[PDB]
Amino acid sequence: NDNYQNNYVVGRGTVYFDRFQDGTNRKTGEMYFGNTPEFTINTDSETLDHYSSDHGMRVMDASVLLEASQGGTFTCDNINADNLALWFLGEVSNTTQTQQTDAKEVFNPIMRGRYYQLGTTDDNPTGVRGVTNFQMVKADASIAISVGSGDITSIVGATVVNPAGNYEIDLEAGRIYIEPDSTDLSGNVQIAVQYDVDAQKRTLVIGKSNMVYGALRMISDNPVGLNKNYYFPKVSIAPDGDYALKGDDWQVMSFTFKAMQLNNITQRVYID
Amino acid sequence: HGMRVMDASVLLEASQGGTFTCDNINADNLALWFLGEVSNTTQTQQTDAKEVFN
Amino acid sequence: NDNYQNNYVVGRGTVYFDRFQDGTNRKTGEMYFGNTPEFTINTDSETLDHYSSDHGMRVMDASVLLEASQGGTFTCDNINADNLALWFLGEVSNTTQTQQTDAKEVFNPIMRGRYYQLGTTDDNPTGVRGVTNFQMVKADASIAISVGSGDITSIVGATVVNPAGNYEIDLEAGRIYIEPDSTDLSGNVQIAVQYDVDAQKRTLVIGKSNMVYGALRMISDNPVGLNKNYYFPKVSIAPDGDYALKGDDWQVMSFTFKAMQLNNITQRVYID
Amino acid sequence: NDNYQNNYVVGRGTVYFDRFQDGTNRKTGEMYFGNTPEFTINTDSETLDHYSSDHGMRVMDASVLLEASQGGTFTCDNINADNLALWFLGEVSNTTQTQQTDAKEVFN
Amino acid sequence: MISDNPVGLNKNYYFPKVSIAPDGDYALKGDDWQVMSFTFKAMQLNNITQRVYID
Amino acid sequence: MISDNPVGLNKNYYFPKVSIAPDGDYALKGDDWQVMSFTFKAMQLNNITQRVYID
Amino acid sequence: NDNYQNNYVVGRGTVYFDRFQDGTNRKTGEMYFGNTPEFTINTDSETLDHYSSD
């Protein structure tokens, strides 16, 4: 016997991650998640045994371990554009928009009392932010309108719509709200518009569907225990659970992973 | 070599979806919840409408 | 943007129901349930999609809705003879009993300390209520007794039983309780009785097994919101859950339904 | 419309039971359980419908009720020799023992 | 979902094609206020535009 | 078979001569609802009109 | 290559039949069966080939 000294620990540490290039195993640089409120490591280990058939009832002659899937789940509270690329399995795209003038667009079916987004194209699919000079005219819905060139006040069947009591626009997002009580836009009426687009740098997170491989690392600085840090040479980050946007608590993103093996030499988990 | 060594893995599907509630109850949201359609009609002003309950 | 005004609502309203005649679709008149403490409408909607097999892994090319079963459950607190006909899947029977005299009945096996019901016939199967003049005699159980006519004090093997210390009768229900310590009725002893039946109108709820079709309607008068009322042209009322008779809370009857479709024109749900 | 009067109820009552003779349907006398603290009646009713196959997706053309099993559970607090015959599925036997002397027995 | 967050750097979501379906139950009478639980499932519009666009 | 398909571009079939024969069994009593399984075999009416016409 | 649009289908339809008079080929009027829960079309096609012997 002896007077023994245990190693109690409270876990506090940062979690790092570096993606691999697509279809290869080259690093790209470890990113910083943020404050991860939990970081668990679980193991599902099924076995396989053989009960002997020479004496006794169900005597275990030999057993062996089939698999031991090293994995775990974690959440994170820092929400930037970079972690949403991992949760939505997508990629950050830092683009701009072209400063164009006289951008013309048609809305053929119209119910009044409905929002409308200006400029849903293939270049900027989520919309156009920044509108300088807005003008629109109305027409009957049974007439097909060709706005291939020229102004819209000069085309046939056009009637200029007053800006008061008929619609309402904000210029920081380019959103048209047709009024629910607008006598000029009642009936079966279509609308052709024009607007001017500014130029600013904007960020999209285009959420495709591909599994993201990479290495995981938790450097820990424990406040009461002898600290130690973990390293996973290859995991596969997948989204887990739900991502509740609105509520009372603060928004967390629950992740999960599954530690694979990089090659025939380097193994799955390295505790330093 | 080995017992259950993961040589390669891949993602079959990733179903992006979600649920939400709403508290504003008008005639327009009930068309979405009941999978139906709003019908704004009238009734004909008729007189001497006769009906039997057997 | 705008200053928007929501439509908040607290639901309070009455629930109506009219049965159909058996094997047809004719109405009979909407009954009033009572205060229904809850009335829910749920929808189980399974879908069917087809993942594309030309590019990508599990890309949804097209999806469609197989079924959308409009249905719901509700409870009710008003317990009369009319709602028990719906919960027990039966039918209210408003009958009478025939005012007869000298009604004679035999009880061949007798354990003492047991209740006995007078007049379990095919006309009034639950019993006979209202007894005027009760007399009974005892005999040995090995002797078959024929009480086809005449009084019972004059038949063979008869011994008149004293009313004190041997049995006990209430006349409002016609129930015989043989005393647990009665020396006159100990052993293997049978009993033949006589009694007189009064005449009063009585109500039974004969609980058969048939599905009850009908239309459902909830006219609502909401105390804080813009009210609106529902109408189901054909549902099928079925009993749901349990009906706890004794306890602390007040007795509720949980129902359920499943909105069918009346014909090829009228659909399943009409919100006004 | 009207001023309606509901029928609210708190359930308190006694529960009676009379056995049948074995293999027959003859009564024997209703016994008294005691204070039964609960007495519920539940119904498990599965149905059978036929979705039409001429127009639409899963349009209920006709439905019908297969079974409606009327049943229930209850407890009881009075424990005598008579209710234990029902719970243990047995039978009360009121016997005696023979007054004998010099009863000899071995425990090996 | 255009969001105007009271404490964080706000951002808005866009789904090019979903399929709104009713979910859960719609309790009419009770104590709390009536809510309608919906659900959706983000499909893909064509071979170019993908399922989710965070701006 | 005139078809009115709920999700696809509908089309209808026409067989100028078949021979209806009973097939399988016709279970009278049971749990499911009684169905009658038929079968046929598309013959040819003459030397001009063929066996199957999809419109 | 292109952005192709398939033709997916769920089959729902009615099945009609008109008898012939006995020993002839004259029509008599198409009857309505009812809801037919399935309607399959199968083809048994045996072939005949000749393996070369040169």
Residue numbers in the entry:
A (entry chain C), C (entry chain A): 2 to 273
B (entry chain B): 56 to 109
D (entry chain F): 2 to 109
E (entry chain B), F (entry chain J): 219 to 273
G (entry chain J): 2 to 55
Please share text taken word for word from the publication where this structure appeared.
Here we have determined by cryo-electron microscopy (cryo-EM) structures of the head and tail components of YSD1, a phage infecting Salmonella Typhi. We investigated the structure of the recently characterised phage YSD1 as an example of flagellotropic χ-like phages and more generally phages with long, non-contractile tails. Samples of YSD1 imaged by EM showed characteristic features of siphoviruses: an icosahedral capsid and a flexible tail tube of ~220 nm in length.
The 3.5 Å-resolution structure of the YSD1 tail reveals a robust but pliable assembly based on hexameric rings strung around a central spine of the tape measure protein. Our structure of the YSD1 tail reveals that the helical tube is built from hexameric rings of the three-domain tail-tube protein. The rings are stacked with an axial rise of 41.2 Å and a twist of 19.7° to form a right-handed helix. Only weak density is present for the third, C-terminal domain, indicating that it does not strictly follow the helical symmetry of the tail tube. The main body of the tail tube is formed by domain 1, a sandwich composed of two four-stranded β-sheets with a long β-stranded loop extending strands β3 and β4 (β-hairpin). Assembly of the tail tube involves the formation of a continuous antiparallel β-barrel connecting the largest β-sheets of six subunits on the internal face of the tail tube. In the assembled tail, domain 2 stabilises the hexameric ring by wrapping around adjacent subunits and locking them into place like a latch. Unexpectedly, for such an elongated assembly subject to substantial shearing forces, there are relatively few inter-ring interactions. The placement of negatively charged aspartate and glutamate residues in the assembled tail tube appears as a right-handed helical track through the tail tube.
